[PDB]
Tab-separated table of C-alpha atoms in Angstrom:
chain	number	residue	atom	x	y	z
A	322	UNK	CA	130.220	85.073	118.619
A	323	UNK	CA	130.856	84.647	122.411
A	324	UNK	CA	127.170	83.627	122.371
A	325	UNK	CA	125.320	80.905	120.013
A	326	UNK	CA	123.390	82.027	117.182
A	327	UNK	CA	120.137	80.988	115.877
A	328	UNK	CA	120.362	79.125	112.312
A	329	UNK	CA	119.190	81.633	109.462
A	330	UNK	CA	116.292	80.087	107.285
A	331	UNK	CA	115.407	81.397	104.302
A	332	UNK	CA	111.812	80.454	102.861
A	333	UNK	CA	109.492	80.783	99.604
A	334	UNK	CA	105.856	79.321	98.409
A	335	UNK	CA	104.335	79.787	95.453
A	336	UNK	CA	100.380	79.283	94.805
A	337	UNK	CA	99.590	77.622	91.684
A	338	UNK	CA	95.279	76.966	91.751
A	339	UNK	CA	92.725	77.472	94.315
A	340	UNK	CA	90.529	73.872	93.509
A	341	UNK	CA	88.029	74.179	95.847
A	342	UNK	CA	86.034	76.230	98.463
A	343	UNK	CA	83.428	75.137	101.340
A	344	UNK	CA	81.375	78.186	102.234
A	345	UNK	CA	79.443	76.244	104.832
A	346	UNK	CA	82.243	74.840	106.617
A	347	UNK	CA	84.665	77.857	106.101
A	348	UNK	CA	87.537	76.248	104.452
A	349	UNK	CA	89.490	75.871	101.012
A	350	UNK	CA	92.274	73.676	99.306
A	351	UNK	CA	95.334	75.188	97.503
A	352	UNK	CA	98.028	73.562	95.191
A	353	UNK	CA	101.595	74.960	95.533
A	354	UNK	CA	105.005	74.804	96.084
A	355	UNK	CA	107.506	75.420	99.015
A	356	UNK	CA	111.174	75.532	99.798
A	357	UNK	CA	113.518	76.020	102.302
A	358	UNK	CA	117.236	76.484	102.855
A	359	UNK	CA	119.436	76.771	105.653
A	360	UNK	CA	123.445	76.388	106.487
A	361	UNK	CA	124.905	74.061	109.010
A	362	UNK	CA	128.230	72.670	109.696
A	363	UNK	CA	127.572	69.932	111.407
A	364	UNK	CA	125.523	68.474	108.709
A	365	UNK	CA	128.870	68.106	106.950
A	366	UNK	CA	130.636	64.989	105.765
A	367	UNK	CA	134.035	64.305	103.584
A	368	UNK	CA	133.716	63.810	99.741
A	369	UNK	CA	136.402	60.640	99.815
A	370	UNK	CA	133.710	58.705	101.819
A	371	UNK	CA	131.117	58.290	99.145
A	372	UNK	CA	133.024	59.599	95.975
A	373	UNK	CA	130.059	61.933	95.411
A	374	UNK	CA	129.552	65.882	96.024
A	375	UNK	CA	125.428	65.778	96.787
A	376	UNK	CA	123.756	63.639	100.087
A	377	UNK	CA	120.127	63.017	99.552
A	378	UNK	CA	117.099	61.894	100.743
A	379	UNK	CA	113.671	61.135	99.255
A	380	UNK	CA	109.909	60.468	100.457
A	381	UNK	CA	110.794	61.761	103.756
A	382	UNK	CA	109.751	64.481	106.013
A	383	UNK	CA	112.505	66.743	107.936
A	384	UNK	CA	111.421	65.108	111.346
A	385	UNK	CA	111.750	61.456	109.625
A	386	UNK	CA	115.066	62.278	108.627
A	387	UNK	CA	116.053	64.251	111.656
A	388	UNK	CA	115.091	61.068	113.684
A	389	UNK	CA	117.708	59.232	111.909
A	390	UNK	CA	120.006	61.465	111.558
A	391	UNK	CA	120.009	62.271	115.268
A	392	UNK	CA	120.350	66.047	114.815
A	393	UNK	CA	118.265	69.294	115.023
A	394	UNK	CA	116.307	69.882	111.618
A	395	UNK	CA	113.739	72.954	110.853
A	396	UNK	CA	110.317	70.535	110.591
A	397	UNK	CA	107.689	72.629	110.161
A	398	UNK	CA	103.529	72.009	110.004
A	399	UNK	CA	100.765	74.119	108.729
A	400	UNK	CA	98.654	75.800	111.457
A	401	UNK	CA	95.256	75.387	109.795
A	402	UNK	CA	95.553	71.879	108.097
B	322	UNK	CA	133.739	55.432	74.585
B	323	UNK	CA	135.733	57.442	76.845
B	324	UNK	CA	133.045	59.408	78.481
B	325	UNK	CA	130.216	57.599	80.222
B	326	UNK	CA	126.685	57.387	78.368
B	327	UNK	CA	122.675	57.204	79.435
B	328	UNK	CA	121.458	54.099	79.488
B	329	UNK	CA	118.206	54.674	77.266
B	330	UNK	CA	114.973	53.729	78.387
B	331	UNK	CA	111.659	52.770	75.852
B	332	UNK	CA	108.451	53.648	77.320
B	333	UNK	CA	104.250	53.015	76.134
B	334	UNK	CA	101.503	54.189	77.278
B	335	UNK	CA	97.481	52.928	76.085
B	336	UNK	CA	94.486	54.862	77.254
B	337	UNK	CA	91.428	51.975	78.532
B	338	UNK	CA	88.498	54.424	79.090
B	339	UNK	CA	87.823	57.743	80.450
B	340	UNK	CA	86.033	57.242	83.621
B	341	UNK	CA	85.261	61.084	84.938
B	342	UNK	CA	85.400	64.938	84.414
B	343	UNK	CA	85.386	67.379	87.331
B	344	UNK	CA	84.059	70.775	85.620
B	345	UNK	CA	84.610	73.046	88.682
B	346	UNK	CA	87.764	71.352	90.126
B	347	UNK	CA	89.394	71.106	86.678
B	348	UNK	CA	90.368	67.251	86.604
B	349	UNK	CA	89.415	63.673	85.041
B	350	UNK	CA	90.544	60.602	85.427
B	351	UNK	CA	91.599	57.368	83.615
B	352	UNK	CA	92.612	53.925	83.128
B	353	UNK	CA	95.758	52.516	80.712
B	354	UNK	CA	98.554	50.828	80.896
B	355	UNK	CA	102.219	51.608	81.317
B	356	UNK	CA	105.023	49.506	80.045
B	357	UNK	CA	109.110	50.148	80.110
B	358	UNK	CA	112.296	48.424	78.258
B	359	UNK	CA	115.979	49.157	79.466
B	360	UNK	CA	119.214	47.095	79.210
B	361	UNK	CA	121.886	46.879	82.213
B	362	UNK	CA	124.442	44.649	82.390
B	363	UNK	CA	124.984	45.086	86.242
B	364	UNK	CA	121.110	42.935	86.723
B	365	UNK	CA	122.821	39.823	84.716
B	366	UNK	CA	123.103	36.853	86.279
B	367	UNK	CA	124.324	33.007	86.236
B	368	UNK	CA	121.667	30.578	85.119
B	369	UNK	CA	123.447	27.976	86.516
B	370	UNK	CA	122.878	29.505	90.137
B	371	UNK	CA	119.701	29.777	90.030
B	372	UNK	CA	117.807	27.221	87.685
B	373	UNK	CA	116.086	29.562	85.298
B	374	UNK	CA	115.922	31.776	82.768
B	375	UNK	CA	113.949	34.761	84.134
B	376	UNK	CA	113.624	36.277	87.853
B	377	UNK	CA	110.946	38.593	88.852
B	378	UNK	CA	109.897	40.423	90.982
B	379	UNK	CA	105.773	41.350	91.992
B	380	UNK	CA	103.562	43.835	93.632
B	381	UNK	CA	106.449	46.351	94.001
B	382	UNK	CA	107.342	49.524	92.557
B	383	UNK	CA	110.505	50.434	90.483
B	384	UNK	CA	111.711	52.663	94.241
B	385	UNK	CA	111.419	49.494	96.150
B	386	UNK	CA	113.033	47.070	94.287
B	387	UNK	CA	115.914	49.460	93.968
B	388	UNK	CA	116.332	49.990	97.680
B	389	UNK	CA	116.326	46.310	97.934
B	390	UNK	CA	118.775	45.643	95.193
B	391	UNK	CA	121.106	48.627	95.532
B	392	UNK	CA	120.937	49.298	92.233
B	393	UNK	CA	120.196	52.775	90.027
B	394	UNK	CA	117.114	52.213	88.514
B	395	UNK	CA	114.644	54.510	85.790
B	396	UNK	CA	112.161	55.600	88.523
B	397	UNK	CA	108.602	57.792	87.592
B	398	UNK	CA	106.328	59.818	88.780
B	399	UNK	CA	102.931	61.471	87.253
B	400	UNK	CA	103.495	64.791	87.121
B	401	UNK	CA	99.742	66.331	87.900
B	402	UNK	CA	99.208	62.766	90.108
């Protein structure tokens, strides 16, 4: 590709209740689950460095770990929240 | 043993008093207690550097003092928290 290309995302959510609804204020909460998976290079790294074949990171959002990092994540927000 | 093995883990749980019921939101809640036993041999120590027979370690949970030790440790979560 003479050009760049945009990274491919792929995305799911599931719904499992609806706990609540607020007929005066026009809103409603929702329990669930979402997931997201995409494929960059430059995220790689060399398995003789840390003798281990998975990288991970816990209680942290995608910009939190983007900022230290110091490369371009997919963060996302939800428009209504 | 040739092949490595779990380090196993004894957990106990005691139920206080059941303080509420949510009918139309589908919850409760509750008070207890939680306790855990494991063995490592990686957290010994030397009395003789320190003095005493037991260290300790307050107001933390099991996540933190890991990060601060650099150590694997049996982390937990409620599931429907």
């Amino acid at each position: 590709s003479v050009f760049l290309e945009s990274d491919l995302v792929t995305v799911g959510l599931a719904v499992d209740q609806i706990v609540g609804v607020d007929q005066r204020s026009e809103n409603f909460s929702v329990v669930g689950t979402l997931k997201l998976s995409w494929h960059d290079p430059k995220l790689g790294f060399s398995p003789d460095q840390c003798g281990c074949t998975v990288k991970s990171f816990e209680d942290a959002s995608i910009r939190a770990v983007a900022g230290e990092i110091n490369l371009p994540l997919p963060s996302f927000s939800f428009y209504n929240q």
